[PDB]
Amino acid sequence: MDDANKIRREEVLVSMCDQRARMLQDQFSVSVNHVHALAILVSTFHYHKNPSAIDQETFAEYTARTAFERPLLSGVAYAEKVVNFEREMFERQHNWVIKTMDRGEPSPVRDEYAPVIFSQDSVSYLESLDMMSGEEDRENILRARETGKAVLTSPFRLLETHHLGVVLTFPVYKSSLPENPTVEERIAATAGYLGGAFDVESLVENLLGQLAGNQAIVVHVYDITNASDPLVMYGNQDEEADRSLSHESKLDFGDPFRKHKMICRYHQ
Amino acid sequence: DDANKIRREEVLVSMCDQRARMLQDQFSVSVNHVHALAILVSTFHYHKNPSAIDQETFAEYTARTAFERPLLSGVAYAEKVVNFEREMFERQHNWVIKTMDRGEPSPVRDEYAPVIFSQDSVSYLESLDMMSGEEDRENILRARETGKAVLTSPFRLLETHHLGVVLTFPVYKSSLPENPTVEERIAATAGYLGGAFDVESLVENLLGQLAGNQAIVVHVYDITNASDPLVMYGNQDESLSHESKLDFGDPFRKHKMICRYHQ
Ligand SMILES: c1ccc(CNc2ncnc3[nH]cnc23)cc1
Ligand SMILES: c1ccc(CNc2ncnc3[nH]cnc23)cc1
C-alpha cells in the first residue's frame, strides 16, 4: 500500500498493457497482409488463369496449410458477386441454390448476392451462403468494393460459434478495372470478396491467456468508432477489477472507418 | 561529463535496439511469405495433377505480392533434377541447364537445381543450376535435410554484385513420410524455393532514411563462427558501442547488430 511502490505498480500496468496492444495490432496486421495475398491468389489462379487452377479442394488445402500465416483468423472464404439476372445460370452451373445465412434456406429474390464458392474447412458451413444476407457482412462488402481496401465490421456474434468477433473483407476485381478508378467503376469491375473471421472471443483469449502475468490483469478492447456508443470487442466489462487505476493503450487495426482502444486494470 | 554521458548512452541503446527490431521484423515477414510460396508450389505444381502452375502464373503472382517480401530482391523456384533425368528435362523445357558463373552448358553432375520459375526481377536466374554456386549449393542441401528455411553467409549476389544473404526453403513430394529421417527427406525432395536478401541496397534503404543516421555507425555481423565474424552490413572497420540482438530464424547461423557514435 506504499507510495513510490504505486508509481511502479502503474509503471508495470503501462508496460504490460502497451505490450499486449502491440502484440494484438501486429498479429492482426500480419493476418490482413496474408488475406490480401489470398485475394491476389484468387485473382491470378482462378480468374486470370485459363482454365482456373482453384476448385474447392484446392482452396481448402492451400488455406489449411497456410493457417499459421493468419493467426487471429478462425477461417477464410471467397464469395463471388452474382447479380439477379445471372442467378439461375450460376445455380445450375454449381448445382446448388444460394442460401440465406440466418436459416440456410433458399434465398429470396435480391438485386445481387455474394454466395461463398470456396471455403477453408474450418468455416465450411459458409459454403453457398449469401454473405449479403447478414447486415454486418453486407455493409463490409459494399465498403470493400467501393474503397478498394480491406475493411472491418463492428463486433458481432459469428455464425455457428456465436463467438464475439469482427469480419475482415477484401475486394477482388476483374481485369477490366480502369487505372485510377472511380467508385462507380470499382463496383462495375467487382468479381467478389475474400473474407476472414477474426474470432476475437476465442483467439484473443488464447493469445492473452498464455502470457505471464495474465491472472493479475484485466484486458478489455473497445470499438470507439462512435464516441458516444462504445462497443465491447473483447472482455467481460461487468467483471470486477481495480477501479482506482487504469491505462489506455492505442490500437490501429488499419481501417480508417473504425477506431479501437485497449483498457487494462489490475484485478484488485 | 556526466549526466549528459548517461543520456548519450540511453539514446544509443534506444536507436540501435529500434533499428535491430525493424530489421528482424522485416526479415521475419519475408521469411514467412517465402514459406507460403513454398506451400503454393507444393500445392499447385505437385499435389494437383496435371500441374496447375507455370512461369507466366508464377511471375504474375510474385510480382503482385512483391510488397509482402521487403528486403528480398526476388524469388525463384528451382526443381531437383538427377542426372538420368537431364535429357528428358531439357527436352521438356526446351533449354539446357547452365552454370551460374559463365552461363555455359553444365558439365555432367550427379544432380542439379535448375531454376524453372522466376520473378521477373530475377529473370537472369532461369535455367541456372543453383548447385553451381557454393553458397546456394550448401543452402539447398541443408534446406532439404532439415526441412526448414536456411540462410547463407554474406556473399555477393549475381548480376548486381550486391552483398547479401540467400534464403532457401525445401519443397517435397507428397510421398514424404511423417517424422521423416534425413534420408527420407532427400528422397522426397522436389525442389527449392529461394530468394535473395539484398542487404547492401535494401537494408541501406531501410536504415539510411532514419533520423539520426548521420550520428551513428551501424554494423550487422554474421557471428556463426565467433572467431571469424563476417560483415553483413556496414564498413570494414575493425570505445562506446552497443550490441543489439538479431535472430533471423536459422539456428545454424548467428547474427548481431553493433552501433557506435562517430566522435
Ligand atoms: C466473404 C466471404 C467470407 C466472409 C467472412 N465472414 C464470416 N466468416 C465466418 N463467419 C461468419 N459469420 C458471419 N460472417 C462471417 C466475408 C465475405
Ligand atoms: C533456388 C532458387 C533461387 C535461390 C536464390 N538464390 C539467388 N537469388 C538471387 N541472386 C542470387 N545470386 C546468387 N544466388 C542467388 C535459391 C534456391
UniProtKB/Swiss-Prot annotation, chain B:
Signal peptide: none
Disulfide bonds: none
Effect of M130A: No effect on activity
Mutagenesis or variant effect for T152I: In wol-1; locked in the phosphoprotein phosphatase active form, retardation of the primary root growth with reduced cell number and exclusive xylem differentiation within the vascular tissue associated with abnormal vascular asymmetric cell divisions, impaired metaxylem and phloem differentiation, and reduced cytokinin-binding ability leading to impaired kinase activity and cytokinin-mediated activation
Annotated consequence of substituting L157A: Loss of activity
Tissues/organs with expression: Mostly expressed in roots, specifically in the vascular cylinder and pericycle, and, to a lower extent, in leaves and flowers. Present in seedlings.
Outcome (variant: T168A): No effect on activity
Domain of life: Eukaryota
Positions that bind N(6)-dimethylallyladenine: D136, L158
Binding site for dihydrozeatin: D136, L158, T168
Consequence the record notes for mutating P154V: Loss of activity
Record: residues binding trans-zeatin: D136, L158, T168
Function: Cytokinins (CK) receptor related to bacterial two-component regulators. Also binds the synthetic urea-type cytokinin thidiazuron, a potent defoliant and herbicide. Functions as a histidine kinase and transmits the stress signal to a downstream MAPK cascade. This protein undergoes an ATP-dependent autophosphorylation at a conserved histidine residue in the kinase core, and a phosphoryl group is then transferred to a conserved aspartate residue in the receiver domain.
Assembly: Homodimer. Interacts with AHP1, AHP2, AHP3, AHP5, AHK3, AMPD, FBR12, WNK5 and At4g15630.
Protein name: Histidine kinase 4
Residues of the whole record sequence present: 150 to 416 of 1080
